[PDB]
Amino acid sequence: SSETNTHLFVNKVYGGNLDASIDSFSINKEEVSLKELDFKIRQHLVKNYGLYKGTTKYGKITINLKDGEKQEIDLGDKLQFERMGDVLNSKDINKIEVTLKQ
Amino acid sequence: TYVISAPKIFRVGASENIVIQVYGYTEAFDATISIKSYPDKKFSYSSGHVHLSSENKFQNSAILTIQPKQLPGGQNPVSYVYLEVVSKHFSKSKRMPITYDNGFLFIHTDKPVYTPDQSVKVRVYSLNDDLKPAKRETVLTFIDPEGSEVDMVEEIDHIGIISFPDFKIPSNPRYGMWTIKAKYKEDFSTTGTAYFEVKEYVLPHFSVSIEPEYNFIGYKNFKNFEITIKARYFYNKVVTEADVYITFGIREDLKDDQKEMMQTAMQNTMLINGIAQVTFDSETAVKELSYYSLEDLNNKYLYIAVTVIESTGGFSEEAEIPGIKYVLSPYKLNLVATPLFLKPGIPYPIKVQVKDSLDQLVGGVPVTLNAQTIDVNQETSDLDPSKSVTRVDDGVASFVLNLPSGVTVLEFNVKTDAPDLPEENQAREGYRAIAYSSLSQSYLYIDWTDNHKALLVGEHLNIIVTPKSPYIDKITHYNYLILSKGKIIHFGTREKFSDASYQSINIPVTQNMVPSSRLLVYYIVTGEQTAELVSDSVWLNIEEKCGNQLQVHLSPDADAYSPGQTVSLNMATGMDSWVALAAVDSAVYGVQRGAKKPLERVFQFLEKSDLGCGAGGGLNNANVFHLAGLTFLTNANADDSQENDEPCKEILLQKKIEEIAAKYKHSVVKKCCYDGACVNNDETCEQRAARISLGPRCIKAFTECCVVASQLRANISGRLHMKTLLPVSKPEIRSYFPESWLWEVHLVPRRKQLQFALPDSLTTWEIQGIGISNTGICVADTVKAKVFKDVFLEMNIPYSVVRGEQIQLKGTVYNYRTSGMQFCVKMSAVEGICTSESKCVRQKVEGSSSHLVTFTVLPLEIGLHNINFSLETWFGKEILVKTLRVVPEGVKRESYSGVTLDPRGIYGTISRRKEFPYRIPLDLVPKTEIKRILSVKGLLVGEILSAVLSQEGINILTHLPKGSAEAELMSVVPVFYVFHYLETGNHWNIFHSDPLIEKQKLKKKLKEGMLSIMSYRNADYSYSVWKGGSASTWLTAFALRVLGQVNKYVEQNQNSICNSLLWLVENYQLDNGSFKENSQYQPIKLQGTLPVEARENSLYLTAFTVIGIRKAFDICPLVKIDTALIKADNFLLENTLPAQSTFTLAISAYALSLGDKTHPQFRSIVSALKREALVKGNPPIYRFWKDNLQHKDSSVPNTGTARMVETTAYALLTSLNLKDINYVNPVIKWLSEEQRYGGGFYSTQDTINAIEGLTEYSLLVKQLRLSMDIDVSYKHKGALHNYKMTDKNFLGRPVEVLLNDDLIVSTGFGSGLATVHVTTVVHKTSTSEEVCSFYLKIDTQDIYKRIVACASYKPSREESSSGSSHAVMDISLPTGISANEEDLKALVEGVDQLFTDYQIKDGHVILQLNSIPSSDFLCVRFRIFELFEVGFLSPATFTVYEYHRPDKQCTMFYSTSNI
Ligand SMILES: *[C@@H]1O[C@H](CO)[C@@H](O[C@@H]2O[C@H](CO)[C@@H](O)[C@H](O)[C@H]2NC(C)=O)[C@H](O)[C@H]1NC(C)=O
Ligand SMILES: *[C@@H]1O[C@H](CO)[C@@H](O)[C@H](O)[C@H]1NC(C)=O
């Protein structure tokens, strides 16, 4: 029941504008489903950084894991149903980072 | 150009936020930062590969972090660091101070005041910089009211609520203000503090209140104030005649335990029918009376304290008022969210804000704003008076002066012009504004508007960004930065609006700025000459919306509870969370529980992590970034931060005597004079001036000032009683404050209910519950919940009652229903109690009050208890059960029966049958049975085992009075030995339970007993006899001694003990290695001539100090004290052997014994002593020494002695050092039959040595597997119990011998060792038999009614004229006859101290003092008031015995009435 306090960066792209907030997540396990990983990421953006409320919905979440790995989950669509089996290591991740398009 | 912001400082274990943002061109480019150590960019703690691009508008964040590298204490490590960044286009870095201030410590004391003997519940909440659980190891360190550590302890952080262990208050602690501090075990400088006051509970006879005209003192009354003081008994009847004494004072605050009184504070206007009054021209009483002669010159407090002693009874009651804040002008301006640098050309926004003496906003008030300014041209300007008036919803009086750009500094004065106030008394301020100088002529101003004083979360911030002025508008981008709690958390860029000037910026206030926030905003200006940064910023108060909404709701939401009702409690949270309940008696805080704030209390403190400062924004883009609590990393401008870093702080006839205080030259002389005259008419002023020790320096200040006050009472005025009040500054408080509850922590995933019944008790419970989780820390709104029963009777039963006396059982039934009502109290007739029924006597109670009750009775059955009481009301009928203690007259206990069961004839013979018979003393108080106990335990060390493991709570092993310090030490003994025994002789396996835990409990029992004494510890580390008394060298050791003994298993404070030794030595060790005793303390009466005794008395001390310095020596092994140790032993050899007494010898023996046990000479001494012994049955079966020394009067009259057993201990100990195993077997055969059921009967000094023996020896010899098979039995009556003893049970139950028969303990065969004790108690009617060692006289006078009892010591043959050693006086008070509490304190509490300790316990007045000289008597006096109506009374008992030798008991009957 590991409780790591990770830090993720938020950046809204209003075109030649960007309002960027730095902040934290809370992983309550030693290994988590990318589903739960994904349900938690948007859950907060949805409750905190204005997502799915207005021009917000299109973006790409970029999970950091190691000195060369960079992946995303289109916020344009929750169509990621096969990879939702994928599982991730708690103390591995280095820094989460999001970028917003309205 | 590039910007890289970062704090103005760093912290360890700090998630330091570091943004990078930049005006770089299209080419995206990499960026790695990191943290490197001073001049060698070698060490790099962490880094971050944060790549920017046009997609990220060239910006990015990085959580660096300096963990704990450099740990070399002493080295000035860590001071300064290099922050480093990297990229393709360049690289840069910096030096900027850092610290070890990570997180915070919150010390939730349960309640913030305690009385003797409560247990201070307490815990600690702890957060890191990031306001998360902050798991860690921490320690606090309690600190007595004088500032000397007293304990310590650490613990484990599982969640963040560090759960420390109860701290119990001393049975008699130092009175004042305690301090609890807290620090992280590991690295981190982080400071926790908190406090708590201990006050001395007293019993209230009658409630005296005191209400002041108003609550402050505004210029209206300054030559007057109407105070009304209202006294009244508990039985709903106000006082009539009473003397009134009222002091007053100044002070600074409410956290100051000391306030410099005033003279000429009016005595006497006689409380008159539940009142009286006065009016107090403040003018007079301060000018010459302290540093305040000016109204004005007062904005501090006014402290009040009355004393109302009732005229009829002779009682006394005291009552105080903390303070009464004076005020100049009832309003107080304070600028609001208004920065003090006016950018030029812009108009300056001045928002003042009036408030009242109570700190609410107050609208509709005038506000004249005179200003002044100077040109850059160094030309002045006197402006023109603007006047607004303060808003109604706002409390704000908005202004604006438009400023001639060439302005500079702007000084201005605000002030109310209330139309009704003296000009004088109009609240005002003054300030200063200054031009953000910038050579590019370029400035910035940002604003916004909201009508509410805070900006709720979720809202949105519209801020206008007017760059006004800059010679040009070629602005690319606006760039912002929002810190919060010392941490940047927001930043970005809005593309500038080409055409027009300013433009709006809209940042969503985020929960992440919860407590406050600042932001700042710079545009990068390309002056043709140089890259110029420019900015401004603001401070941003916001709504204290917590992270986790923790709320607590009571199942029955009723605003009052039935006392004992089961009632469910609710928790709740939008997120899983850790709660922490805590149910105080709301009483504490209470009387005007200052507005301040509940959850803000924390939120205030908690955000002093705001690195920056101000209303916002600086003086140079640098300054602006500075005050931001930042410094930033940019090549273009000077990212400096001048020198250091800004200690910013909140910009964002008894008078005729008191003149002779003119003889001040020291405090104590003031005490020599004050109490000096006090109130003594039973002895002249130079009679009292005799008993004066401290110094002749004061004796003058005594008799001078007494005479003055004595001629005086012949002129102020059968009622006369001078006074001049001064509680000596002692914390007293006429109210108890129950131990709190619901102190458990909890895990609550959004909901948790936990039902429970509330404690029977009259109070209002304030159950407050803090909760903490991953959001941070957040206080729930309290939830009061008074419990209370409408109407209820109480009965004031007495302690005890003598058979055959007629008692008056009082009490009072309580009405707290609004209207009045009808009741019906009836007493149940129990067998042997007498009464007036062969009944329902219905009465009426006026609403919201009380009707006294009474019932008379008279018991013939001694001990007979139980009385059920009952009242009746329309809607109720209740039964309160009570219990009456019934006694007889003249208690003496004779216990000398005792055996050792020795089946195996291991110690001198086979012992398998001893016989304790009936012996009714011909003085028996008829019809009272002879009660007797029979203590059968395995082992010679089983009595000393059972004592400590059958009761809990440490405890003294005699009936000896708790007075001394000594006694408070005699508590730590019985356990210590028993742990040294259990442990060192590993015998933990006695227990069927879990043993390891049994250990702890003993461990505790030790430490806590250990603190029990602190109170008697003086300043210079010298200990002392009775509290505060002149440090006694004797007890300075005796503690040393038992301090170093218990060091074995309870690490004692090094530097404490250290100085503790280095006191005796460096100061009290004569130029011959002997030790002079400081105080006047006589512990023991030594025999011999006045010359002899001196030489004798010197030896004894020098014997005892050694023992001490020895016992403890090992924790402060020290050259300078090893030395003295020999200088000491030397005197000892070189001065013992022409032996003066066996006692003398024996300590001098035992003490060399704890050293070089081989000095030929020691052999001679050991010989001498060893020579002196005597003995019982041949060959020897019992060996022991006598008090004397070869004068052989041989009077060992079948009876032990405190000094006897003390001596033989001292030899038995010496032997048991030298391992003389066969010499000793008879010595202990007889200790172990001396010792009195429970503990070492005779006195103290013996029974610690005596106990040290009996352990040491059962330690040194080897134990004899027990397996007896006892059978106690009546000679004629059939058999009583009989039980196979083993190592399973051996500390078996005690048993009282009921019937009337001769007794017989009588094991079968077996093995091991059983100490049969049998302590038989009987009540006799006469002392005519007994031995008087003290001359007495006791009688009850009338000049209402008061007791004058006397004494003189009866010197035994060979004894010095000086008379007694340390001694007590013990007066029994006739059933129901309270004595003058205030009378005694008088006797002791002074430099004319006739006694030195008083204490009324369970019906007895018990006085301690040093001597009872035999030149004449020594007499106490105190007065008494029948607390009720007592029939034919059986007299009480005035007794007087010498502390150290209980052998000297002259006991005597007397009666408090001639009837
Ligand atoms: C007052 O005292 C009497 C006797 O001590 C109490 O009598 C008892 O009542 C309880 C409750 O039913 C019984 O369990 C006991 O057996 C009774 N004791 C005896 C031996 O009589 C009585 O309860 C008390 N008065 C009240 C009403 O509280
Ligand atoms: C006390 O003595 C003074 C001086 O002799 C006298 O004048 C005065 O009357 C006396 N006090 C009073 C008020 O009786």
The radius of gyration over CA of chain B amounts to: 40 Å
Number of helices of chain A: 1
The quaternary state of the protein chains shown equals: heterodimer
Distance between the termini of chain A: 37 Å
Bound molecules: a molecule of 2 linked components (NAG-NAG), 2-acetamido-2-deoxy-beta-D-glucopyranose
Q: Could you tell me the number of beta strands of chain A?
A: 9
The largest sheet of chain A, given as strand count, sense and whether it forms a barrel, is: 7 strands, mixed
Instruction: Quickly give the structural class of chain B.
Output: alpha+beta
Shape field of chain B: globular
Task: Assign a percent range to the helix content of chain A.
Answer: 10-25%
Task: Quickly describe the structure.
With 102 residues, chain A is α+β, with helices and mostly antiparallel strands. Chain A has one helix spanning 34-48, and strands at 7-13, 17-24, 31-33, 58-59, 62-64, 70-71, 87-89, 96-97, 100-101. Chain B: One of its GO terms (cellular component) is extracellular space.
Description:
Chain B: Disulfide bonds join 546-778, 613-648, 672-698, 673-705, 685-706, 824-840, 1058-1116, 1332-1450, 1350-1419. Chain B: Pfam families: A2M, A2M_BRD, A2M_recep, ANATO, C5_CUB, MG1, MG2, MG3. The complex is a heterodimer of chains A (102) and B (1459). Chain A is α+β, with helices and mostly antiparallel strands and 102 residues long. Chain A has one helix at 34-48; strands at residues 7-13, 17-24, 31-33, 58-59, 62-64, 70-71, 87-89, 96-97, 100-101. In chain A, strands 1, 2, 4, 5, 6, 8 and 9 form a seven-stranded mixed beta sheet that branches. In chain A, a hairpin with a 5-residue loop joins strand 5 (62-64) and strand 6. The radius of gyration of chain A is 13 Å and the shape is globular. Chain A starts with 6 loop residues before the first strand and ends with a strand. Chain B has 1459 residues and is α+β, with helices and mostly antiparallel strands. Chain B has twelve domains: 1-103, Immunoglobulin-like (Sandwich), CATH 2.60.40; 104-202, Immunoglobulin-like (Sandwich), CATH 2.60.40.1930; 203-330, Immunoglobulin-like, CATH 2.60.40.1940; 331-438, Immunoglobulins (Immunoglobulin-like); 439-544, Macroglobulin (MG2) domain (Immunoglobulin-like, Sandwich); 545-592 and 728-790, Single Sheet (S-adenosyl-L-methionine-dependent methyltransferases), CATH 2.20.130; 593-652, Helix non-globular (Pheromone ER-1), CATH 6.10.270; 653-727, Influenza Virus Matrix Protein, Chain A, domain 1 (Up-down Bundle); and more. In chain B, 16% of the residues lie in helices and 25% in strands. Chain B has 19 helices and 82 strands. In chain B, strand 30 (366-374) and strand 31 form a beta hairpin. In chain B, helix 4 (667-677) runs parallel beside helix 5 (696-712), helix 10 (1033-1045) packs parallel to helix 12 (1090-1112) and helix 14 packs parallel to helix 16. Chain B is globular and about 125 Å long. Chain B starts with a strand and ends in a 5-residue tail after the last strand. The interface between A and B is medium-sized, with 23 and 28 residues. Strand 2 (17-24) of chain A pairs antiparallel with strand 40 of chain B. A molecule of 2 linked components (NAG-NAG) binds next to strand 65 of chain B.
